[PDB]
Amino acid sequence: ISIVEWKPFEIIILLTIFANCVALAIYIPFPEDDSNATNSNLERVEYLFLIIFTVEAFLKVIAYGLRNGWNLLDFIIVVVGLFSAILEQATKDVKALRAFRVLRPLRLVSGVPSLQVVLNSIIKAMVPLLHIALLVLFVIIIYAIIGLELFMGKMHKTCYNQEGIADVPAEDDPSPCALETGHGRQCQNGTVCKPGWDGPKHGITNFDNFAFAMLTVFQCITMEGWTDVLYWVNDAVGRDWPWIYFVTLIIIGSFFVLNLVLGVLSGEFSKEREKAKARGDFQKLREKQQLEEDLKGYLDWITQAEDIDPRWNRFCRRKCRAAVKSNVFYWLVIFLVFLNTLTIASEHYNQPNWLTEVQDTANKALLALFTAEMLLKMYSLGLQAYFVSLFNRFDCFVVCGGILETILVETKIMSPLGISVLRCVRLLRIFKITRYWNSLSNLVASLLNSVRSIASLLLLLFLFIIIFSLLGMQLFGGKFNFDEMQTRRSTFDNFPQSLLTVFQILTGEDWNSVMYDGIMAYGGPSFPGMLVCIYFIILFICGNYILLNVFLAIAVDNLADAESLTSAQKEEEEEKERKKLARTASRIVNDTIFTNLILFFILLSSISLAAEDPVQHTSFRNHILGNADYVFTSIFTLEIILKMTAYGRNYFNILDLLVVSVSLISFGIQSSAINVVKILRVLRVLRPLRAINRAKGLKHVVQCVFVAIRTIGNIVIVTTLLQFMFACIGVQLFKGKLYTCSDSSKQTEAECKGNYITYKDGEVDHPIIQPRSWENSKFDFDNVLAAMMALFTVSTFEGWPELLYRSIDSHTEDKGPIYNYRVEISIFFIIYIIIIAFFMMNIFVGFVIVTFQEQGEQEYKNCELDKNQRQCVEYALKARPLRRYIPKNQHQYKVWYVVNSTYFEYLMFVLILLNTICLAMQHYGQSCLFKIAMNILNMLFTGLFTVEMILKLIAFKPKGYFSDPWNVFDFLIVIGSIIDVILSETSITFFRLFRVMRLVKLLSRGEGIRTLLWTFIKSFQALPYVALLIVMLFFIYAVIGMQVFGKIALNDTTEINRNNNFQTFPQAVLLLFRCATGEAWQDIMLACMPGKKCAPESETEGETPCGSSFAVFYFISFYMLCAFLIINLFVAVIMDNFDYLTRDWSILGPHHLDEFKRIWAEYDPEAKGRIKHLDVVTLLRRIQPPLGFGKLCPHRVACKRLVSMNMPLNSDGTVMFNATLFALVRTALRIKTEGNLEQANEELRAIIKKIWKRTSMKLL
Ligand SMILES: CC(C)CCC[C@@H](C)[C@H]1CC[C@H]2[C@@H]3CC=C4C[C@@H](O)CC[C@]4(C)[C@H]3CC[C@]12C
């Protein structure tokens, strides 16, 4: 019984769990205690489910008498279920603790054991991501205290009219202003900046205390709605200083933390790859490839001799086999597939009548030919030889689908969805002529071999989304019903809608807009109501982790196997071909000063180009640097002339000519405004690029990026090919359907003319006449190019929820929207994001990582010296003892003993934390007593810290105190905090930001953090030219945008406003930074479309001549290029720091030997390294075992062995430091034998690590 269980008592319980999961989805949360019959039936099925669970709990309890975590989860689920049922019966919130049933779907993981393994693989590589979760916590706290000492309470005023107010006439979205004494936004002509305002977003986005700032900093770190906060601060305090906060916050907490996380994950995924390689899981894929090749390579013997004729069907088969494989049916079927793609991609909205007949007759004349080829494939090759090859099973699928989908279209049952578009996948056969086919086939082979892993990793992601959908639906079900007219399409009302909302939060787009709604649904910016943001924070930070541990893992662990498979094929082909052939047949220009001065002049010209006035034309600034170009080109013209005589042509020299030329052929037009000038000026922007050839190190990175982009071409091509098919499907589904009338009552263009009355702010007593306009969506699936653009801006995760809910409403061509007509059409978008936004954009990053790893693994000197032994011997050869400065004076000795110990350091580490806590309690609306208490507390803390500084200066003396890098930054904080006090007793805030900087001392202590940060910082410093490509790209694109879109008028109702414009180089760079962050960049692109008003200053013809059609190729290309360059820099840093990222810490290394160096300490002061004799005899006693030894007996055979390890060329009296080092390194690992003393000296000297005679101190 209590052991009888059985086997079928689990499978029954699992089915009950699934039934509970389904019954939890049909439930509909109603707004205000409403209900229907289905909910009443589910409330009684819950009783049966609880009875079953209680019976299970009791039976399992009496078999064991529960220590397992899963059993504990079951127990605490059933107990709280009983509690909820009893409380509901008693009270006849009780209906809030039913949110423990959304935890029942977790029992599915308990049931199937193939998912427990994957769940452990998921939350086991999270422990490494705990030194990057603490750095994030420190950065958020530091920036929240800094923005609290800078922006506390400064965003509580807005324009209010000068009549009957209390309303904010600052338009539908009010923005903070400033009184006419500061430098913030000034109210309009007929408005007044008055205090007494709630806040920018109902009071949730503020810096009023260390609860509202900790959330604003997190939201800005997630790179969502950070420009909104930056602009709100810009409209409240000024525009000069606030950008330094929000730019550094994202550079450090969103572009460096992301790099750290990516590096740790990519180094963590390589250890398991090594473990699998040691176990030998790649062999199974290796054998399957060759055996399948031979199992198809030997079928020709059967098929070529199946029709031996010693009735007469040989008439055709003896030539059908040749004809269909004679390089004619290849280039003819490819041509037919090209024609089919032509007829599929030529369908737009409102096409001519002949085109729809051409595409109706070709779609049949080509299907007939493909079916004829189908029957010929079955005949000339045989049935089995047809269904061997993978491409030959998908082609049968496509042809049978075409045949079965013509019927549905001709019989008028369902509307076309796109089926023949899968025939364009056959265009991949073009790769067979080049070498980019073995890798592509191998990648698909690995993807198909790993299916029980992909479909199992996606199952936990689906379970996560389902669980967080039911929990969110219980929390916010029906509570999003606000009085305002907006329907709030992203709610938690049903299961499909709550799934869409959770998926949108997972992608991250507008994740803060849903949380701002879930906060007001539980009250407002109050204490208990706002504790609901923990749901969204946890969902975001635990969904974007599984989204990087499920997709990047697949991409990396499959693309690493694909490379090994391709290498195997290449090696086998090379060996076989080699065997076959062998077996069968047997001037002052070149000076430094000129180059350096020309490089300096290049920078001068670039800065002169970046300082031009975009909007203004007749200005003095556009004259001086419009005149310095005259002299500037004179030097550059000269430079070519006297260097021409040294030659009689490299491509860089041709570029420098071109450049010098434009300039030249420009101030000579001196008349032809006729564009020309204005299309020859936007070509000076090539100046920076003439420094590539004169800045060796900058040419190398350009060449490396060119090799990288040549290598990654297959991924881009097969991603564009897939996006094309998705665009064609979108055209089939949504052509001419996403049209809307301004009046939401007319569903026809002929019905959408005239005017209509709209009521402002949903007030029936405030009528307003507005015109009726039949308008399309911002991005529409009308033709194939518009579909491509819309899908691109969907894959960038920008504005995709708007397009999704506009596509859901569309029902018929030339008709308006219908609320939630086809919600099921969201599957198209979900699939697109899953494939083209989560999988294919991670395959590219995995490919970059794998290629860089292969480049780094090329030879590595390939000569012994195990991967740690290089550093071990290098350190044993270039390690010197460290200074200690034991005080000589007897009093200074006691003082330095006081400040050198755990007590003083750990008490300072407590005072620092107390000071930060005291800095954290700073609300908006503090009493005078609170503030004057804070002042005295700050004075006391700074007095204590300056007394600590005095003590340290006295103990360590002024060279010793100042030598430590951490005691020179402590001096600056003390001076700033000591200037702060005196200036507070009568630019004062610049010194108030010094005290909060003392918190970094706590981040300094403790390994892990201090090692990862240092290694990544020195990796960023080791590659200063990879990060200069991004600077060059930003400069060039900012100048181009400045020249093109400079003159667009700044209306605050559009996306080119006072805050976002191209009218200055800093502002253009900020706009490009925002676009790189991916913050409504498509809105800026649309606001830069042709047909806008020019600025009043920039010069009738001025109807709408501002804005160019260049915006598409500007913004899309900038996005792609910036993403490529950022990923290049990230992976370059990761691979430069790939020793720390995978170190296998159970072995010796820098951690186990820098300890040594220290452990020498005592037995040494200033350098020297001479032993006490009694050190070599007390060693192990402190040294740790996994490196040296474990506190055991000095004569332990193994420790006496440490004595057997004797003089390595020195003197027993005083070991020359390094001595013991090597000795300990040699005994720890790579133990050699007797007589291998100069043999080791040549084991290093003969290949690498030039000794430089140093063996004078190490011989034997
Ligand atoms: C190799 C294949 C995929 C090439 C595809 C190109 C052809 C089929 C497509 C791509 C973009 C298409 C154009 C997109 C938009 C318009 C505007 C309108 O006036 C209808 C026709 C027209 C002009 C389309 C004609 C067909 C078109 C040119």
Ligand SMILES: CC(C)CCC[C@@H](C)[C@H]1CC[C@H]2[C@@H]3CC=C4C[C@@H](O)CC[C@]4(C)[C@H]3CC[C@]12C
């Ligand atoms: C841990 C993840 C999965 C979910 C986190 C949910 C828990 C920790 C949070 C999120 C939403 C929170 C609720 C939000 C608002 C209110 C209303 C008020 O009466 C105070 C408590 C109460 C009811 C909170 C209790 C705690 C709560 C339920």
Ligand SMILES: CC(C)CCC[C@@H](C)[C@H]1CC[C@H]2[C@@H]3CC=C4C[C@@H](O)CC[C@]4(C)[C@H]3CC[C@]12C
């Ligand atoms: C990226 C490399 C080129 C460094 C950039 C430095 C140069 C191009 C930048 C840095 C500081 C900038 C200046 C900062 C402030 C102003 C005042 C503004 O009213 C007109 C532009 C002007 C005068 C900027 C021109 C461009 C500028 C000189």
Ligand SMILES: *[C@@H]1O[C@H](CO)[C@@H](O)[C@H](O)[C@H]1NC(C)=O
């Ligand atoms: C934005 O620009 C001006 C500023 O008032 C004005 O024409 C209008 O508000 C906006 N432009 C258009 C074309 O609506």
Ligand SMILES: [Ca+2]
């Ligand atoms: Ca966004």
